[PDB]
């Protein structure tokens, strides 16, 4: 039972008996497992087709963009500083991979991260710039987040980090399943705190479906070169590919535009279907 | 005939003469924790028959204007006998369920109800300027549950929001079309065929055991697929009965007293 061909079709003749495959009861919740041979006459044919690439592994074997991170490299005195940028890791900033993942309730998988970096000038020539090097540091929850592009935190004694040189092939790393529970949960119908009757109101309030305050942490990105007289702007694009994935409890797909991290929906976008007629082909 | 059934749990028992069948969600029966999958090390508590018994909720009336009903578990049973006491005296808990919906009519009535059991049944709020902002009190109505609506009306009191849901019926309350909800465990009550539905729900979660006061594992939704009408306004009652199964509690503390209003 691995990439094997689907079952063959048999031959059937006329039927005259007290057996009624076509009559069933949808009320019971089960689906009638019929085949064409149970209702029409058929010829024998050898089957060759297989379901090898509708599987869960092949359905998630695509790298999908999830974020774009922007940093600058210019004299700090200018109106816009040498902007190191902070991004909190999530897949809900985009809709495609989010929609694909939310076909299910729980899942386990390893992740593959790919980074593509591009840069460009913003003013008319006025010289050039030497090749730039970027640092991408992972800041797990509880660690100190950088507050300046040249802080002590960038020593990365224990934090993982990647140094990337412009013009080279994209960077890539892998990470295991890092959940504190036995599987990730795409939905959580609950709260993180209970408001107690004997306690003041403000002390028990919480967001709906928040679960852990922040699951996985932060990515910090900067240019390592000091500065150039000319401003240079660069962007980093993050791509995700789940590996060795498992899933449970399928769900209906999203039918309307997303609105925030939750299942909420916005007014004026609740009419997905279009016009048709009952007796029109 | 195959339409007759009898079920007994503890000192409770049920008999039916016009049942379609019983559905077990995902074909799994409720069970206790195995030694190879138990995270906490303390000795659990199993009240057994003292809590594993059928409880009857308040009945509701089905008319032409009804849009639907929904409940949450274990929230709906928070005030039921010793089950609620064990829920509030302990930090951790888990259990399965047996849900039985009862609705009968004469041979001259018509209509249909769709009964769905959904794990992690998130619902959409009413605010259009904030997200995930509904309050605990409104999100847990108890044994009275809530109702679906046919239209979306966003709240506009930005300085004093109501902080409550607004589930549209055809979007199933969560942005997904109703017609696709049959992917969840379900059973249809068609008045011409059967007059009851029974569902067996095992414990489903990403954790072996969790807090019962903060998190709801299952949700129950009943919506009319075909409107009710009768020779002619028509009205018939729907009553709901639920029994915890294989319930287990851990982490005994002093009792919790949540703010319910």
């Amino acid at each position, epitope marked *: 039972t691995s990439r094997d061909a689907l079952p063959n079709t048999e031959a059937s003749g006329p039927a005259h008996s007290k057996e009624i495959p076509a009559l069933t009861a949808v009320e019971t919740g089960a689906t009638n497992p019929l085949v064409p041979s149970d209702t029409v006459q058929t010829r024998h044919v050898v089957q060759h087709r297989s379901r090898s690439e509708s599987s869960i592994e092949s359905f998630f074997a695509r790298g999908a963009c999830v974020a774009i991170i922007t940093v600058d490299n210019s004299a*700090s*005195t200018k*109106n*816009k500083d040498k902007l190191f940028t*902070v991004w*909190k890791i999530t897949y809900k900033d985009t809709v495609q991979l989010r929609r694909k993942l939310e076909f299910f309730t729980y899942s386990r998988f390893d992740m593959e991260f790919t980074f593509v970096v591009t840069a460009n000038f913003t003013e008319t020539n006025n010289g050039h710039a030497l090749n730039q090097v970027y640092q991408i540091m992972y800041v797990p929850p509880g660690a100190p*987040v950088p*507050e*300046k592009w040249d802080d002590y935190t960038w020593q990365t004694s224990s934090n993982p980090s990647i140094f990337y040189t412009y013009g080279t092939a994209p960077a890539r790393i892998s990470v295991p399943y890092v959940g504190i529970s036995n599987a990730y949960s795409h939905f959580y119908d609950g709260f993180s705190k209970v408001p107690l009757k004997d306690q003041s109101a*403000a002390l028990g*309030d*919480s*967001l709906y479906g928040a679960a852990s*305050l*922040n699951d996985f942490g*932060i990515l910090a990105v900067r240019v390592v070169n000091d500065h150039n007289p000319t401003k240079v702007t660069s962007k980093i694009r993050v791509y995700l590919k789940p590996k060795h994935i498992r899933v449970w409890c399928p769900r209906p797909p999203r039918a309307v535009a997303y609105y925030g991290p939750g299942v909420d929906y916005k007014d004026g976008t609740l009419t997905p279907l279009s016009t048709k007629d009952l007796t029109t082909y | 005939s195959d339409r007759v059934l009898q079920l007994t749990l503890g000192n409770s028992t049920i008999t039916t003469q016009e049942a379609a069948n019983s559905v077990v969600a995902y074909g799994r029966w409720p069970e206790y924790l195995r030694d190879s999958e138990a995270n906490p090390v303390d000795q659990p508590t199993e009240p057994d028959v003292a809590a594993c018994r059928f409880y009857t909720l308040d009945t509701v009336s089905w008319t032409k204007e009804s849009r639907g009903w929904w409940w949450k578990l274990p929230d709906a049973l928070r005030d039921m006998g010793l089950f609620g006491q064990n829920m509030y005296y302990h930090y951790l808990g888990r259990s399965g369920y047996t849900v039985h919906v009862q609705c009968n009519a004469s041979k001259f009535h018509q209509g249909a109800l769709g009964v769905f059991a959904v794990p992690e049944m998130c619902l959409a709020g009413d605010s259009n*300027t*904030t997200t995930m*902002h509904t309050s605990y009190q409104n999100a847990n109505p108890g044994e009275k549950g809530g109702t679906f609506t046919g239209t979306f009306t966003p709240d506009d009191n*930005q*300085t004093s929001p109501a902080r409550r849901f607004c589930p549209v019926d055809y979007l199933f309350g969560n942005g997904t079309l109703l017609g696709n909800a049959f992917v969840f465990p379900h059973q249809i009550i068609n008045l011409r065929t059967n007059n009851c539905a029974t569902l067996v729900l095992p414990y489903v979660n990403s954790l072996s055991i969790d807090s019962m006061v903060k998190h709801n594992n299952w949700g129950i939704a009943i919506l009319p697929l075909a409107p009710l009408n009768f020779a002619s306004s028509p009205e018939i009652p729907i009553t709901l009965t639920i029994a915890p199964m294989c319930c287990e509690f851990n982490g005994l503390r002093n009792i919790t007293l949540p703010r319910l209003q």
Partner: antibody
Amino acid sequence: QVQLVESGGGVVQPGRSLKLSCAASGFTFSTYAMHWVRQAPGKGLEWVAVMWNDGLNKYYAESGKGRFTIFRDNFKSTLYLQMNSLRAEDTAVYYCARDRSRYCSNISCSRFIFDYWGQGTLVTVSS
Amino acid sequence: DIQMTQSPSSLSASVGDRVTITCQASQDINNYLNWYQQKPGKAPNLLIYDASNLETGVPSRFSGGGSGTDFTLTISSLQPEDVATYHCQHYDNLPLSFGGGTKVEIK
């Protein structure tokens, strides 16, 4: 340099209500906590309230507690302050400021250092 | 709550002088204090944080010190454009609070 612009200030009769707004630009609004600080004419600074970038958790100083309300709209990148029962002692210039608490909803991991300030809007309680 | 007391309320000095300003706390707050500068008709500007760290872009003639209940801001050599009001601000715990402010003027 980010941009913070306040508006809504003006003359208000005693005992009435007023609403202030602060529009933010040049940065990701929904990842920072925002503050209100006021300065009476010729006096020192005075802190009012904070909100921890989620729209739900907040804190008020004892001067305006009970009367003032702070809320935000992350989709429009705007901050609001609703004032009720205004007294003659509430006359001051109101500033909206941004601290370094980025992904934080608790005092434990916040740190209140104000990097940016707005131009300020004047509120006068007189008749 | 914590009360911040600043002294002197105002002072005068000649260009090139060494000026010192003190902010005092009603209880020990480790090193949770900031300093701000506010020129007439403008919003405050951050000078020091953590009671010793100099904000980027600030002239090196500003420096902060102290710990516990006593803190100090000093200007090594006063310049014409330093005339402004100076505030101290603590963040030991909520609610936050500022000092009374100190005016600096040329003699």
